Amino acid sequence: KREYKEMEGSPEIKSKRRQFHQEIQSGNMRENVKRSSVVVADPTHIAIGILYKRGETPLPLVTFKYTDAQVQTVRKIAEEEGVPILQRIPLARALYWDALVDHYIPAEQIEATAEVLRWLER
Amino acid sequence: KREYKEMEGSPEIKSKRRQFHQEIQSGNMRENVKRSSVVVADPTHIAIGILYKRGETPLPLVTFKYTDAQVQTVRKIAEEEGVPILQRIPLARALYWDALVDHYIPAEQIEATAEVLRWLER
Ligand SMILES: [Cl-]
Ligand SMILES: [Cl-]
Ligand SMILES: [Cl-]
Ligand SMILES: [Cl-]
């Protein structure tokens, strides 16, 4: 169900899928941060949530995207909820444009997401 | 009133200003496209409206930002309304992150916006 499907469709349908999956999402900001493993950010611009739990998620999942001043609120909530936030500017930007929320990460972001998650695992 | 104010504030207040000016904007998509001189786009990702009218606008103004599938609708409306759309990927991305709607363009985008407007003037 959470498959990104790189080889299926067109750039136009990928854009429709991104908007649709964003719009159908039911969670509020705190719910989205609390269900994430880590947040990657471009400070003052973008925050992307990532969920990865071995045996539950076959691949990392993008849980949310927030922009501009919402990033300040995301950082406050993450501190309250004990969710680590990392500065990863090119990764956050690439996931912003290309990733679908509530779907596995795009193939192009595997290397960079794995680097973040090696850090998270320690 | 439409001053970007590069030297004033902080990156955090600029992010609050971007969100606020986006939220207070009253126009619908057709109204926003119709009042623009040109649209710059990253197809399937970003469309930014620019207004520049000699003697009325001291500098080009950003009129709107639309993303993902909304870009398809922007392109359809622009054709209906006779507003030219250009593919300018780095300019569209830079205005997306940094520009404030209903304010003059950021100083960093002067060179690239002027290039677009030389084209528009012909
Ligand atoms: Cl996938
Ligand atoms: Cl490492
Ligand atoms: Cl200005
Ligand atoms: Cl030229």
Yes or no, beta carbons of A70 and B45 under 8 Å apart: no
Angle between helices A70-81 and B11-24 (to 10 degrees): 120
User: Which of B68, B74, B96, B101 to mutate to probe the A interface, most A CBs <10 Å?
Assistant: B68
DSSP category for residue B99? P
Residue A72 and residue B15 in contact, taking contact as beta carbons nearer than 8 Å: yes
Structure solved using which method?
X-ray
> Residue A51, SS3?
strand
Give the strands of the sheet with A61-67, arranged side by side: A61-67, A46-51, A38-42, A85-87
Nearest bound ligand to the CA of residue A122: 2
What are the residues facing B104 on neighbouring strands?
B61
What values do phi and psi take at B51, rounded to 5? -115, 125
Q: Give the integer Cα–Cα distance in Å for A56 and A53.
A: 6
Residue at B26: amino acid letter: S
Asked whether B52 and B61 are in contact (CB, 8 A), the reply is: yes
**Whether A63 contacts A113, CB under 8 Å:** no
The domains of chain A, with CATH numbers, are 1-122 (3.40.1690.10)
Separation CA A86–CA B59 (nearest Å): 37
